[PDB]
Amino acid sequence: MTAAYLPSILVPIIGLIFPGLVMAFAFIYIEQDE
Amino acid sequence: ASLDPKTGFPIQGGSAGCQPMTQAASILDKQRTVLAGKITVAANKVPVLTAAVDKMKTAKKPKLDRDYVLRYSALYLTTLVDAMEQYCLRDANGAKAAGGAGLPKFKETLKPASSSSLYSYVDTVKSGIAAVSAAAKAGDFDGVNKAAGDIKTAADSFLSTANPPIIFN
Amino acid sequence: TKFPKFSQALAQDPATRRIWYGLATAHDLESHDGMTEENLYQKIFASHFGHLAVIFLWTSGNLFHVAWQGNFEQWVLNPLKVKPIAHAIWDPHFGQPAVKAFTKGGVSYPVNIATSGVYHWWYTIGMRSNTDLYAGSLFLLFLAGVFLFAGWLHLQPKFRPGLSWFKNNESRLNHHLSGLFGFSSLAWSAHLIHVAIPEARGQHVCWDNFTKVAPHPAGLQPFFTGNWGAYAASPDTTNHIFGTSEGAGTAILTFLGGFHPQTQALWLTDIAHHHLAIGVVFIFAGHMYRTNWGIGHSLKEILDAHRPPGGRLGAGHKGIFETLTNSLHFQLGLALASLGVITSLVAQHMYALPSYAFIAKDYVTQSALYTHHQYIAGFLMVGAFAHGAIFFVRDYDPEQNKNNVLARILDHKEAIISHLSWVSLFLGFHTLGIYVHNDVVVAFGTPEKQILVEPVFAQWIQASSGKALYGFDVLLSSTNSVAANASSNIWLPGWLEAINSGKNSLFLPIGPGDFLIHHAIALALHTTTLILVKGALDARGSKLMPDKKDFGYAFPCDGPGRGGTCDISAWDAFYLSMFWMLNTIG
Amino acid sequence: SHSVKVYDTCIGCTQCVRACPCDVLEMVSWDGCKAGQIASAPRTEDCIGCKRCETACPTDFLSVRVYLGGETTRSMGLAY
Amino acid sequence: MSESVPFLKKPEALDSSMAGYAGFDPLGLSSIADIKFLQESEIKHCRIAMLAAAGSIAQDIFTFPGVSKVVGTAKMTGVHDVLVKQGAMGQILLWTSFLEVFGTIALLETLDGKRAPGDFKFDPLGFSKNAETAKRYQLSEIKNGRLAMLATGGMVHGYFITGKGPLELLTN
Amino acid sequence: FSPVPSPEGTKETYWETKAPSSDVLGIGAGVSSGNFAAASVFAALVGGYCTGQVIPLTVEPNPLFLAGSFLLPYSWALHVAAWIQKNNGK
Amino acid sequence: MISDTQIFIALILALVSLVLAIRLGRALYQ
Amino acid sequence: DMSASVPFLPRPAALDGSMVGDVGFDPLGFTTKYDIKWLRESELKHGRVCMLASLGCIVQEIVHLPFEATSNPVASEAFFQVPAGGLWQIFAGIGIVEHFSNNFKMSGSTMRAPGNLGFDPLNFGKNPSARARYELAEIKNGRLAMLGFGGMIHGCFITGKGPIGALTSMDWHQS
Ligand code: CLA
Ligand code: CLA
Ligand code: CLA
Ligand code: CLA
Ligand SMILES: CC1=C(C#C/C(C)=C/C=C/C(C)=C/C=C/C=C(C)/C=C/C=C(C)/C=C/C2=C(C)CCCC2(C)C)C(C)(C)C[C@H](O)C1
Ligand SMILES: CC1=CCCC(C)(C)[C@H]1/C=C/C(C)=C/C=C/C(C)=C/C=C/C=C(C)/C=C/C=C(C)/C=C/C1=C(C)CCCC1(C)C
Ligand SMILES: CC1=CCCC(C)(C)[C@H]1/C=C/C(C)=C/C=C/C(C)=C/C=C/C=C(C)/C=C/C=C(C)/C=C/C1=C(C)CCCC1(C)C
Ligand SMILES: CC1=CCCC(C)(C)[C@H]1/C=C/C(C)=C/C=C/C(C)=C/C=C/C=C(C)/C=C/C=C(C)/C=C/C1=C(C)CCCC1(C)C
Ligand code: SF4
Ligand code: SF4
Ligand code: SF4
């Protein structure tokens, strides 16, 4: 496969960092009052 | 400095500066590296056919797959000839084949792909396509193998005499 | 305290219900606080462009992952033996036995084998290499960007469409029939004739040569002389090996019928001639409505004048124009009912008449595609009835709809619902009873006693289309018939070969088991309709709750009084019919 | 909060007020019915939405009508 | 009652003021299509046919330098078959279509009633200044155009059946 | 809920009479009932003839007979218009 | 086969599509 | 009332003769749908680019830089023959000029009288009335140039010789 490094680089980022970050931000936005 | 065996893209950078603003390469030279890369991909897929035909011959009961040999010919061998014809066209007529005469059209009024120094290799590959198909109809395993080898030698010879500029861009 | 910014009632809820309800009501723009009609139609327009882009990003993703990680070039060489690769697997939870077990497809990495059929579709329409699958992925990424920018652009103050634009029914219908349906079907004929037909015959045609490579040797001279039959001359031979020049014809438009003998799919020249025919038809149909030049029909005039003089429909369709246009839920329901029937047609006609080369030998792909599109069909059909219920609750005005078809449907709501109850019960009692009769008798060692009823009506229909298995000798099955003689010179020889041969799913043999299951499907379609129709018709009120309209579409109940009112809302009949949809598509 | 309405078909039977667990309803003077009284809802902020008032209503269609609306800590029945 | 057709009724949409009025509309087609649209369509047919009738006659009389080399013997419709292969038919089509694009705009103005049917205000030489000569000449243009419509079909069908061409059919 | 637009020239076509007003015929509102009835029979005969002469369809069908075969469904709408015009006294 | 440069072009165009998606989502959200 | 250029067609409302080169020639009603100033600035930009291009093609046949890849008579062929990096340098440089011009404002923001970037270093236009005559002259020359340049770029496509060669050598005695 060409760019075989990209699945190792992206799948943990998209599958762990992306949800963690967007869940954290979504939590902050839903809880915040102003 | 060369073209990738599989993807066919420029491989290494290695005042003719490669960087876009300072590039000295013409659009004709960039079209020529595109065509040369496509020639490289098609020629380097000839070993795959040779391996498949060897697998067919060494089976317990051996039959040539006319469908595989003809579909490989349709997918790569016809593509190899068209890419070589276009490179010959650009080598002979010059800038006119790069769009200088306009959109590709019938009665393009430009010098033909023949009368090019590199055209003889294109004739060799056309003979190779005919042999690949004739052997597939005949059922001759050895015929397909040698014919693909003839195509491989001709395409490598074409690239060597062409000396295509590799435009990393 | 500010997450549902569109709902102050939820944004002041101190519970976890606020998060759930803000997430679940987010796309119901009509219910948002301070919502005007201008802003409603303009947000729906922009979010329709976002759906357009998501579809294009999804398709670009399938093309990119097949161009990058698939075995498309290996598969196109040998399409009956190679298994198509969807995308690769990078899973850090895999063991080394799992990594080895998924390393099929002729590659060196674990992979998922594609059941979507995209390899057969991309093969049939011209794609040969990874470079053109990738080029398609790039073009769809560009189109996704174009439609995301269009969605943003049509939210800008100068570019905000007015309500007069959004309700121009005649211009939208003229353009969607003649441009979106008709011209794009005509353009799809051009793609087949210019690209897919030559590349099915070995000759590569791309953007690099398609203006200097004629689809026909004569070439646009027979078309501009009326010699159109010269485009059917010398069709593809029965010896044709798809993708190659051997056995290839020169025709670009045929009506051969049946199937290409090798790929076991419809002829691509039949498909190109189909989209040319259906294109011209739809383009003609898109000149029906009056827009700016005084010719055409007013939709208001057509609807008002279609009241039968016998008075059996009451006021007929007077006031239906306004109701449809003003009600986005009535439009969604018509659109979804229409779309649900089509994706059922898609599922039924793509297994019996496959268009893609070497599919219908990909049994997993055929099973997945049929199952996928029938489940999409059941969802769309249930949603159509759901939004008809939402239409009645939210958008239906009885005074504006006096004695219409809609008012008179509500007037006899109990006749409709009780007769759906009857036919559901009728079918259910008997179909289950015959099945149980068969089970009990077979169990008791007496299979002969089984009530096996031949599907004669459907068999007569098969025979009428030329199946000779049942010996009906009706229409096409009879050699000396007016119907048979008429189509003999055009599509009948191929069709008769296709239908009579047992190698295809065209008009598959039907027997007593087929009859019983069809009746089971009739009970399921009638029962899902009963629940959905009962929900839609009783949406606005019932004897149990007369003022149900005042409570909305989705409310829990009216409490334990009056005997108990659980699942009394129209939403709850959506809910109950969703199980019946799942059961019927099952 | 919930919205609780009393319609002029109320016969002034006082049953919905007795049913009310949250003192939402009370009786006011009204000449419309023979009893001289109609139910009123000046405390719909305490309304939990139990709809016990609707059950106690002997009119063919409940004169008292609870329409469940925005939820609060009080209308959710939360002791926390 | 009608002037041209005494048994039938006077056509309701047709009036004496209009050029080439003989009260002739037996099928009543003026009710079916807008009379201004019909009037402009007739004038467009009249002028194209007038040019076409004289065209056929003039081409039999003589050809322009070199056309005889391009088309060996074909005349009338046959020369058109040769000229689509060359560029003459396409080039005339491109320019006539370009004028017709402005004609489409003019037709819209006529349907509005802003512009008279068929009036493109083309007077390089003013021969309609008198305004009664204009009435006569418009009647003449309509009459010669209707005659030319008939004539153009007549001579083209003579080509279809005999291949001679209009003047040659009389001479042979 | 907002004014629903209709094309200019949209007029009222709801009817409860024996026949709709002739305005439902659009551009054919002024045609006599005899003219529709004769056009209807003419269209039925020429459409049926043109349909019949090309029932065994060939790869070379006559285009005039195909186009003339469209007169058969057109004749249906013509006799409906003939009925409407006779019941409007036209 | 697809080059790493070709994948990078696809990633550039998808980033442009992501930015346009953010801009549409912010516009729809108001 | 009625357009001077097309007598049958009515005069376009958003014309009125105020701008230079106003013969009432807007039959397709672009002025109604699109802003007059944007159309005018685009017309001037098209004509100015075309005037340089019309001069460019003719000059490139008559004289060229003494280097290989710049020795092509035909304009269209010259584009592909010349260093592509130089072409991309020209494109970006023109983009810098386009950002510098219009105060970095495009579409609605720019509308500065249309078609003027304030580029008048020399006092060629001594009088304002003479400048108005020059503005008419510029637009008419630009219109001629648009038709001309398209005509010779298409001449390059068919003749493959370049503009002056295309006029001098035609197939006068050849089919
Ligand atoms: C969808 C994407 C995804 C990916 C890529 C991974 C990746 C991984 N998982 Mg899995 N996991 C996932 C989803 C995912 N998880 C989900 C959804 C669940 C719940 C069902 C689990 C449940 C699960 C279990 C129960 C276990 C794993 C384990 C592992 C590790 C593989 C074993 C290994 O080599 O150990 C080597 C692993 C390491 C050396 C750990 C590296 C720690 C990382 C690099 C630090 C990252 C910092 C952190 C993300 C900061 C984020 C903050 C937040 C804002 C995002 C690997 C890190 C195993 C594990 O934890 O490994 C010890 C393990 O026991 N996973
Ligand atoms: C020719 C002009 C034209 C065209 C092409 C379109 C096109 C479109 N408009 Mg329309 N529109 C027009 C003029 C036009 N418009 C005019 C003049 C107005 C104003 C009066 C509008 C007002 C308007 C509104 C108000 C809306 C649209 C919307 C849409 C989009 C529909 C969504 C979609 O993807 O459907 C695509 C549909 C098809 C491709 C055809 C469906 C095919 C049927 C269902 C079955 C065929 C199956 C076939 C085998 C396909 C196989 C695929 C392959 C996998 C096998 C679509 C892009 C909507 C939208 O999404 O906004 C962006 C919307 O809300 N338009
Ligand atoms: C003999 C009495 C009787 C009669 C004449 C009817 C008449 C009708 N019923 Mg039935 N029904 C009855 C009893 C009866 N019902 C009972 C007892 C029940 C409870 C199980 C139902 C439940 C029922 C449903 C759920 C439905 C009907 C429907 C219908 C209508 C369609 C006819 C049909 O298919 O029947 C169908 C009959 C049944 C499904 C149940 C049959 C019940 C048994 C066999 C009859 C009871 C015999 C009774 C004890 C006789 C005692 C008299 C004796 C002392 C002399 C019709 C109005 C359908 C409708 O509305 O469609 C328009 C419908 O959906 N009915
Ligand atoms: C195997 C599972 C099953 C079965 C048989 C049924 C059966 C039925 N459902 Mg139900 N349903 C189910 C699961 C099931 N449902 C589930 C999981 C859901 C999701 C919540 C629903 C939701 C649902 C709704 C919302 C609706 C139905 C309706 C129906 C009826 C549709 C068929 C019909 O009209 O007549 C078929 C009749 C039968 C199959 C009854 C069988 C006949 C019996 C067994 C005779 C046996 C007599 C025997 C002597 C009894 C011995 C008892 C012993 C103690 C002496 C029927 C009563 C609809 C309805 O009532 O329409 C009228 C309706 O509105 N169902
Ligand atoms: C096809 C084709 C081409 C062509 C072409 C062309 C030019 C085709 C043109 C065809 C035309 C104009 C036919 C005209 C028919 C007129 C008729 C029948 C009127 C008759 C009069 C009647 C009925 C009654 C009259 C009447 C008389 C007698 C007395 C009573 C009253 C009155 C009403 C006055 C090309 C060039 C493209 C070449 C291509 O390769 C093939
Ligand atoms: C549901 C949703 C919500 C709201 C409504 C909505 C908008 C309509 C809808 C749409 C959602 C949509 C349409 C969502 C679309 C989401 C998309 C298209 C996400 C794409 C992400 C791509 C990335 C992160 C690639 C980055 C590449 C990089 C950094 C490479 C860089 C580089 C490399 C190495 C090489 C070149 C040089 C450099 C630059 C250095
Ligand atoms: C609930 C609700 C409330 C109000 C609003 C609302 C949204 C509108 C509504 C929803 C309503 C909904 C959801 C309605 C759903 C409606 C549906 C799904 C209707 C299906 C119609 C199919 C037909 C008429 C097929 C006809 C085939 C024929 C004639 C074939 C003929 C044949 C041919 C040509 C070929 C073969 C031979 C034969 C057999 C002769
Ligand atoms: C309206 C009007 C008024 C009065 C009467 C009138 C005169 C008769 C009438 C005019 C009517 C008419 C008919 C007016 C006709 C106007 C027409 C048809 C103009 C054609 C324009 C084409 C151009 C400018 C192409 C430019 C190509 C470029 C820049 C680049 C090309 C290339 C690309 C792609 C990449 C770079 C290199 C190459 C290969 C060179
Ligand atoms: S049980 Fe039925 S009625 Fe009592 S609350 Fe739950 S749903 Fe409403
Ligand atoms: S219960 Fe119903 S009727 Fe009795 S008082 Fe309360 S509301 Fe009035
Ligand atoms: S709902 Fe429960 S609380 Fe609210 S009023 Fe009726 S009874 Fe009192």
Short mmCIF file of N, CA and C in Angstrom, two decimals, chain B residues 20-31 95-96 98-103 105 108-109, chain H residues 69 72 74 76-89 92 156-160:
data_model
loop_
_atom_site.label_atom_id
_atom_site.label_comp_id
_atom_site.label_asym_id
_atom_site.label_seq_id
_atom_site.Cartn_x
_atom_site.Cartn_y
_atom_site.Cartn_z
N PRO B 20 7.89 25.54 -8.00
CA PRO B 20 6.96 26.12 -8.99
C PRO B 20 7.28 27.47 -9.61
N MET B 21 7.53 28.52 -8.82
CA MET B 21 7.76 29.85 -9.38
C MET B 21 8.98 29.88 -10.28
N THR B 22 10.02 29.13 -9.92
CA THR B 22 11.27 29.10 -10.64
C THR B 22 11.37 27.96 -11.64
N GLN B 23 10.29 27.19 -11.85
CA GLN B 23 10.38 26.05 -12.76
C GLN B 23 10.65 26.52 -14.18
N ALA B 24 11.60 25.86 -14.83
CA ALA B 24 11.96 26.17 -16.20
C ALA B 24 11.32 25.21 -17.18
N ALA B 25 10.64 24.20 -16.67
CA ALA B 25 10.02 23.20 -17.52
C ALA B 25 8.78 23.75 -18.21
N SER B 26 8.61 23.36 -19.46
CA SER B 26 7.44 23.74 -20.22
C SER B 26 6.25 22.87 -19.83
N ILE B 27 5.05 23.29 -20.25
CA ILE B 27 3.87 22.44 -20.08
C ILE B 27 4.01 21.20 -20.97
N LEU B 28 4.72 21.32 -22.10
CA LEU B 28 5.03 20.17 -22.94
C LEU B 28 5.88 19.15 -22.21
N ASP B 29 6.90 19.61 -21.48
CA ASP B 29 7.74 18.70 -20.70
C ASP B 29 6.96 18.03 -19.57
N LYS B 30 6.08 18.78 -18.90
CA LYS B 30 5.23 18.19 -17.87
C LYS B 30 4.23 17.19 -18.45
N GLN B 31 3.67 17.46 -19.63
CA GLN B 31 2.84 16.46 -20.29
C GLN B 31 3.65 15.23 -20.67
N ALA B 95 5.12 21.61 -29.89
CA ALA B 95 4.16 22.24 -28.99
C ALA B 95 2.71 22.10 -29.44
N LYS B 96 2.47 21.83 -30.74
CA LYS B 96 1.11 21.78 -31.29
C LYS B 96 0.29 20.67 -30.66
N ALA B 98 0.48 19.76 -27.67
CA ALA B 98 0.25 20.06 -26.28
C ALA B 98 -1.00 20.89 -26.07
N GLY B 99 -1.77 21.12 -27.13
CA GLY B 99 -2.91 22.00 -27.07
C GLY B 99 -2.71 23.24 -27.87
N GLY B 100 -1.58 23.32 -28.57
CA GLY B 100 -1.30 24.47 -29.40
C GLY B 100 -2.24 24.59 -30.58
N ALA B 101 -2.78 23.47 -31.03
CA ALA B 101 -3.75 23.45 -32.11
C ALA B 101 -5.17 23.39 -31.59
N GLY B 102 -5.36 23.39 -30.28
CA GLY B 102 -6.68 23.46 -29.72
C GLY B 102 -7.09 22.16 -29.07
N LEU B 103 -8.41 22.00 -28.96
CA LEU B 103 -8.99 20.78 -28.41
C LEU B 103 -8.65 19.61 -29.33
N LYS B 105 -9.22 16.83 -31.81
CA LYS B 105 -10.31 16.81 -32.77
C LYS B 105 -9.88 15.97 -33.94
N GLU B 108 -6.84 17.08 -37.12
CA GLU B 108 -6.13 18.00 -36.20
C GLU B 108 -5.06 18.80 -36.96
N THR B 109 -4.73 18.40 -38.19
CA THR B 109 -3.75 19.14 -39.04
C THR B 109 -2.39 19.27 -38.34
N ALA H 69 12.41 27.74 -26.27
CA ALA H 69 11.12 27.61 -25.58
C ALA H 69 10.35 28.92 -25.68
N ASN H 72 8.36 30.44 -30.65
CA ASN H 72 7.17 29.87 -31.28
C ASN H 72 6.35 30.99 -31.90
N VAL H 74 3.23 30.72 -33.21
CA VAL H 74 1.84 30.53 -32.85
C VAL H 74 1.67 30.79 -31.36
N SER H 76 -0.87 30.05 -29.18
CA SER H 76 -1.38 28.93 -28.39
C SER H 76 -0.29 27.91 -28.10
N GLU H 77 0.53 27.63 -29.12
CA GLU H 77 1.67 26.74 -28.97
C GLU H 77 2.71 27.33 -28.04
N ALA H 78 2.87 28.66 -28.09
CA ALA H 78 3.84 29.35 -27.25
C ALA H 78 3.51 29.17 -25.78
N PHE H 79 2.22 29.18 -25.43
CA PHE H 79 1.78 28.97 -24.04
C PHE H 79 2.33 27.66 -23.46
N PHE H 80 2.11 26.56 -24.17
CA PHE H 80 2.63 25.28 -23.73
C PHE H 80 4.16 25.20 -23.84
N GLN H 81 4.75 25.82 -24.87
CA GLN H 81 6.21 25.76 -25.06
C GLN H 81 7.00 26.53 -24.00
N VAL H 82 6.52 27.69 -23.54
CA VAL H 82 7.29 28.54 -22.61
C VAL H 82 7.39 27.88 -21.24
N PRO H 83 8.37 28.24 -20.39
CA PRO H 83 8.45 27.64 -19.05
C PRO H 83 7.17 27.87 -18.25
N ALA H 84 6.62 26.76 -17.77
CA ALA H 84 5.35 26.77 -17.06
C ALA H 84 5.46 27.50 -15.74
N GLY H 85 6.62 27.40 -15.10
CA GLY H 85 6.86 28.17 -13.89
C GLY H 85 6.78 29.66 -14.13
N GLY H 86 7.26 30.11 -15.29
CA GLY H 86 7.09 31.49 -15.69
C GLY H 86 5.63 31.88 -15.87
N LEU H 87 4.83 30.97 -16.43
CA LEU H 87 3.39 31.20 -16.58
C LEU H 87 2.71 31.32 -15.23
N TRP H 88 3.08 30.46 -14.29
CA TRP H 88 2.52 30.50 -12.95
C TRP H 88 2.99 31.75 -12.20
N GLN H 89 4.20 32.23 -12.52
CA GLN H 89 4.71 33.48 -11.99
C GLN H 89 3.90 34.66 -12.51
N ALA H 92 0.32 34.55 -10.72
CA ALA H 92 0.39 35.10 -9.37
C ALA H 92 0.64 36.60 -9.38
N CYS H 156 -5.19 30.56 -34.71
CA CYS H 156 -4.03 29.72 -34.29
C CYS H 156 -4.47 28.25 -34.22
N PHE H 157 -5.68 28.00 -33.72
CA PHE H 157 -6.17 26.60 -33.59
C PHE H 157 -6.31 25.96 -34.98
N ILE H 158 -6.84 26.69 -35.96
CA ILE H 158 -7.09 26.11 -37.32
C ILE H 158 -5.81 26.20 -38.16
N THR H 159 -5.29 27.41 -38.37
CA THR H 159 -4.10 27.62 -39.24
C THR H 159 -2.84 27.02 -38.61
N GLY H 160 -2.69 27.14 -37.28
CA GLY H 160 -1.44 26.70 -36.63
C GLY H 160 -0.26 27.50 -37.15
#
